[PDB]
Every structure is written in structure tokens, then in C-alpha cells.
Symmetry: D3
Subunit: 150 residues, 6 copies
């Protein structure tokens, strides 16, 4: 249950007032919020975030958009939260996302897909370390932990 993942509301998600909605879905699921911030990514930060896509033709547009305004960065904790977080978000391409998921309910275009979630335990650890300083994470015990976990 101490697994952690990085979830972000992308600039489109902030602009379209989906921050609270996204946070609510993670809270409702049983996951625990241990880091939260609002920040405007720099271009260098955007380049790193999208580094796997550096050779794609839409990279420069993605990097520019991701650094064009604020995101909300989050760290969530819970059993299977990396994979579970992504299930909440829905398929990467909103054409594939199902209703009930964040992208299924709210997104149409793969380049404006509202949010991001780490794709593995390892990439989660890297992303958390990239976006948050040690002193910015909060460790606490949910009063509901024994209701959510056996």
C-alpha cells in the first residue's frame, strides 16, 4: 500500500476546471494524497517530461503547450496506485477511453488529454523525484486506512 505515483493535470485540464474533479476521483477511490502543487513547467522541464517522444513530429508543440501555463502535480499513495491511477485516467488516446474515466468523460484529442500518470513503479519514482523536493512530500496516516485495506 505504500506504492506511489505521479499524476498531473495538464494545462488544458487546469484551464477547463477539471482539477477538483480529478482529485475527487482519486480521493473517492481510496488513494492518499502525499504531494500537491500548482506550477508552470519550464520549457526544459517539458522537454524532460516528454523525453521519450523527442523524435516525434509533434514534440515541439507538446513541449510548448505543456510549458504554456500551470499544471497541478500530485503524488498519490496506495496499493497498485501506479496501474490504478492510469485506469482512472483512461486510455491515453481519448478515442479509446471509456466513459467513467477522466479522459472518457472529458477529453477528445490525444494532444489535449487533460492529465498524465506515471507508467510504471520505476518511472513514478523518477517523476516524483523530478517534480517534488523531499521536504514537499507529506507523510500522514489516513484515519480510513483499515477500511480501505485488509
Amino acid at each position: 500500500p505504500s506504492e506511489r505515483t505521479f499524476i498531473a493535470v495538464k494545462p488544458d485540464g487546469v484551464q477547463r476546471n477539471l482539477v477538483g474533479e480529478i482529485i475527487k476521483r482519486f480521493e473517492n477511490k481510496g488513494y492518499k494524497l502525499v504531494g500537491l502543487k500548482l506550477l508552470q513547467p519550464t520549457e526544459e522541464q517539458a522537454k524532460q517530461h516528454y523525453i521519450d517522444l523527442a523524435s516525434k513530429p509533434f514534440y515541439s508543440g507538446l513541449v510548448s503547450y505543456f510549458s504554456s501555463g500551470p499544471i497541478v502535480g500530485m503524488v498519490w499513495e496506495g496499493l497498485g496506485v501506479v496501474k490504478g491511477g492510469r485506469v482512472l485516467l483512461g486510455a491515453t488516446n481519448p478515442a479509446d477511453s471509456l466513459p467513467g474515466t477522466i479522459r472518457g468523460d472529458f477529453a477528445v484529442d490525444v494532444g489535449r488529454n487533460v492529465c498524465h500518470g506515471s507508467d510504471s513503479v520505476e518511472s513514478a519514482k523518477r517523476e516524483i523525484a523530478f517534480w517534488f523536493k523531499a521536504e514537499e512530500l507529506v507523510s500522514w496516516t489516513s484515519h480510513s486506512v483499515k477500511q480501505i485495506y485488509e
Copy 2:
């Protein structure tokens, strides 16, 4: 193209069960743009033409009668992939097969009371839109959120 359009209807059961606002909200929340909207009472002949492809099916008479038994809300929605995407929002035709999160998955039980309709293709959408709406009844406008919803 983001200028694709589809026809969505709330069927008489959906109107009677107060699902009009809920259905509209889901389409708005998705990012689709409302360009036509009206409340109307279909005639039996209108229902027959709308469902003409299904004239030989055993449920046709019942469908036609029910569709014309009270008001529907007709809508035209605009957006990238909206024909296919609209139907995904509605859920499987038979509510037994619809998933929670979809309109039929959340709100319907019986295939003959499945709350709503969506065009099944670009071509049938164009026909349905022209059938239910006059040219002057559609409204062209630009969503202030278009650049937040679409990359181009």
C-alpha cells in the same frame, strides 16, 4: 475533422424519466459543441422514416409507435469523431450490454426503453440532421474553449 456532426435524441422514455439535462451535460463535459436543439413530438410517419432501415424487423411497429408516443429532444453535436464518440457516451444499444459510465449503462434496462438515439455513421448523421432540422435552425458559433480541447 472537428467539424463532424451527429444527431443525438433523447427518446420519449428519457424525457419522461428526466434524463434530458443529464444527457446534455455528458456531451458538454466531453468537449462536444451543441449546434442544434429542440423539443418536438415525432409523428408516426417521421418515426417510420427515421427507422426505415429496420422496417422488416419484428420490433419495428413497436419502436415506431413508442418513438412517436411523446416528446423527444433532438440535438446536433459537433466535434472530432463525434458520431462514434457520441455512441460511446450512449453505451451499447441493448442496455444489458451497456457499461456503467455510459448513459444506457447508468440509466436503462430494456432495449425498447433505451433512453436515447445516436446516428451510426457520418452519412446517416448527415441524413438525420437534414431530416430533423432546417438550415436556419442550426447555430454556428465558436466555443471559447476550442483551443483547449483541440491541438489544431
Copy 3:
């Protein structure tokens, strides 16, 4: 009488901000019956007539221009006390004075972008309904829930 009617509009800001479904849902949830619905683009002259009582006010030109700047959704709702009750659902005219739970209390900040309109009396409702809707555009039907909502 339960056959009282009022005109409610989602103003251009309400349409742009995706509040059409939300507003309709609140009226459906309350028990009111939808008997007219359309999306339309008011003209400046239509906006001037609709707000004619306010011609001398300093905000009139701005109001008229804004009301005609993009689509509205016009509605006719039917029910006991619906004129007064509809306005209660909308909340105080100036959103600074609107309470949470109302449409303006939950969703609006500025009196000039207050999301919606409702007729202020039985008489002005009748005038507004006749102004925005033709006779053939209203739909008369019976809600299957009328005896659950009304004692008589």
C-alpha cells in the same frame, strides 16, 4: 395552478461555459415540466425588445449586445408556482447576492455574466413565451410522474 408557465434562458455565457445540461437538470429534478426548448442566436433587436423595460438603464447597451453575441437556449417550463420557483432556482440577479445551491450562487460571479434569465411574473412570462416560441413549437404532454409531484 400547476399549468403555470415561465420562460427560462441560458444566456450566451452559460452556453459557452457548458452549463446548459446542468441548468436543465435542476429544473427536471425540481419537478417542473419542459414544454419548449430551442437553441437560437438572438438578434440585437430581439434582445432590445426582451429587455425593453430597462432601455433607460446605463447597462442596457452592453446587455443587449452581449445577449445577442452568441447562442442562448430558450426554455418554457410548466408547473405550480414555476415563475417564482424558477427564479429561486436561478438565484439572485446579482451573483454577489446569490446563495450556494442556486445556479448563480454555484456558477456565476458578475451581474453582467449571470448565466441565465427567468421571467419575473406570470404576465411577463406569457409575453416572453409568446415572443420566443411559436404556438406549434410548444409540446403538450403529461408527465407520468404528475401524481407523485402534485397532490391534485
Copy 4:
């Protein structure tokens, strides 16, 4: 349309304030509520309810947890309600449950999966008879029945 199923909010679901939410989803779907009660299962009741799983390694924990606090028992009536009720709940193991379902939206751990639904017409009849006395079930007609059923 007179098929019936037994649905329970398990002790974790009651503790986490999901009773209203779960009822709402069944009402919204078109199913009819014909029995409803809050009760504290005994250990012996839990054992019988789960008797088919007596040999499974999680049985003792399940039986103990199911009897650890109040549940809300329900009987719902409608066409295909046994199978349809389970679709609303979502897969048994929340790791497999999809967003939009009760367990997909609200649960993380298979041992804290919020709710129960009968798995067949036959087991539904048994469970209903087990949890409810005849006088606790109400026969009535929904004024919306012709809007929900052809």
C-alpha cells in the same frame, strides 16, 4: 421483470459512507427497491452466507470482517437484476473493476470491496430468504414501470 437479487453494502461501505451512493446507482438504473435494512451480521450468519467458500484461505478473515459491523441489506427487483446488479458493482477484485462501477470508483482491495451481490437467480433466492423475513419485503408498483419496460 420480477426477478430479484440481494445486494449488501459491506461493513467497509457503511463505514465509508457509500450507502446512499450505492442505492442511488440502483435507483438510477431503473431497479425497484423491495427490501432494505441495516443490520449487524453475526459470525454464524457470515459463515452460512459464504458457506461455498469454506475451504478457501481467506474464509476466516472474510467471515470475521463481514460480521465486524453493520451492513445494509437490500432486495432489488427488475429484468436481469441479478446479472445487472453485479455489473453495477463491478468485478469482485477491485484491481479488475472499471471506473463507472461501484468497486471501480471506490475500492482498492479485494478484502475491502465495499459491497456484495447474489451471483445467480438461485443463490439470490436463497440469500433473500436468508436475510429477509417475508414481512420485510414490500410488494408495490413503480409509477415509472412502463417507462423502464416494454
Copy 5:
């Protein structure tokens, strides 16, 4: 915080699928559910429930309607729950009820006002005793009690 009140969803509220919604609002507020049942009031029970209105001209209609189909009876526990429960319901006459309340959001007619709440500590105790047997109430501790109460 051990104050208790009787809340009912009237037959109109059940018929119009407002049970879950009403329960959710009480759960969300922080109140604790200690009794719940679905039942069809008898005519004699309706007469007692409306006894203060015996001389009013609409009494016989009220008594008939209240005994025409199921209600959901509830007992809720919490600090100030009698008065607080009524605030959630809204003013008795829906013409006076404010949006945000149950009647403000969902009712139009004073004779079809969806729900009932006890009007005092004393009338609560009487109503609870009238609608529930001792063995039907469940005493339990919400895992959230220290989050809701100082």
C-alpha cells in the same frame, strides 16, 4: 453527539427515486445511520404519524397517501441531528424551501414534500420508538467520529 432523529422518505420520495440521494446527504453531513427500513405504513400508522393534523381538511388524503406505498424509515445519530436533519430537508412547504435542501431541489407541493423529519428531541424519541423495535437499531462506532467531532 448521541442525539437521534427519525427521518422518512415519504411514498413520493421512494416513487421518484430519491432514497439514495437523501441518505447520501445525511452521510455527507457527518450523521450516523443507526436504523433503516423499508415498509408500507398501515392506515392506523398513517393516522398516528399525522395525528396533530387530525382536524385539518386534508388529513384523510394525507393518511391515505402516506399508507399507499412504501416509505424508508431512518434513525440518524449526531450532535444537533434533530434540528440539523430538518435543515437538510428544507422548509416544510417547498414554496419556502431553498435550493441546496432536499425539498428546495426536488419538491413543489406541500402535500408531496418527499420526506419527514422529527421536529424535536422529544417527538424524535416517540417517533423512533413508534417505527422501530429495540432490536432493529444498530449501535456502532464510526471510524470517522474524531474527524467529525471535537
Copy 6:
């Protein structure tokens, strides 16, 4: 419209999973999020934040509780946001709060009233400066600003 206020989800609000809900209400209203973070107040921080109430008999309990676990701090921007933010929260004492407001919907006890909002333009400026560093606030333009403001 550039007025700003400080809003906090108090430790009880975070524990009870009301962060998303509270953010959603502010987003829905039309206010703009310009600062957001999760943090654990220290006792000294709580004391300074509530310094005007040092002589009141509940002070020591308030200071201790406010520093007992994480809060979510927020800065919101908009016309009349200081006064308007407080209207969204509801009266200080939940007994007085109306349904529709955060405390009206979710709180029972004045010592567990879920959230905080600055009480004036001047106290807002102080609180913002106290909880947020300059680099933690983001200056951006909502694409919806002309739809919300005349």
C-alpha cells in the same frame, strides 16, 4: 477581478476526502486557482495564523488541531473572491451553515469545520504572504475570463 484570498482545507477536510470537492466548487464558481499545496502546519504556524484569537478559550485546541495533520492551502483569484469564498464555505459554525455551502453540506462541529477562508482583503494579503512564497504563486490568464467577467 485580481483580488485574491487564501482558502485552506483543514486537517479534518483532508482526512475526510473533501479536497477535490472543495476545489471543484471554487472552479465551478469562476474563481481562478493561482496557488495550491499540501503541507503540514507547525504549531507555531497555527498560532500565528490564528494570533487574533490568542485570548479565546478554544485557541489552544484550535492551534493543536490545525497542526495535527496536512492541510491543503490555496490562493484563489477573482472579483469579490474574499467575501465570495467565505459564502461558498458557509457560516463558521456549521450549526448556522446552510445546505449548498461546504460546511452546510459536510460539517457538524465548529471545531471540525473542514475549511478556512481569509476574512478581509487585508487579512487575505497577510495569509497569502504567510503560507506561500512568491515563486509558488502562478500568474496566468484563464481562457474563460471574458465569459465570467464583463
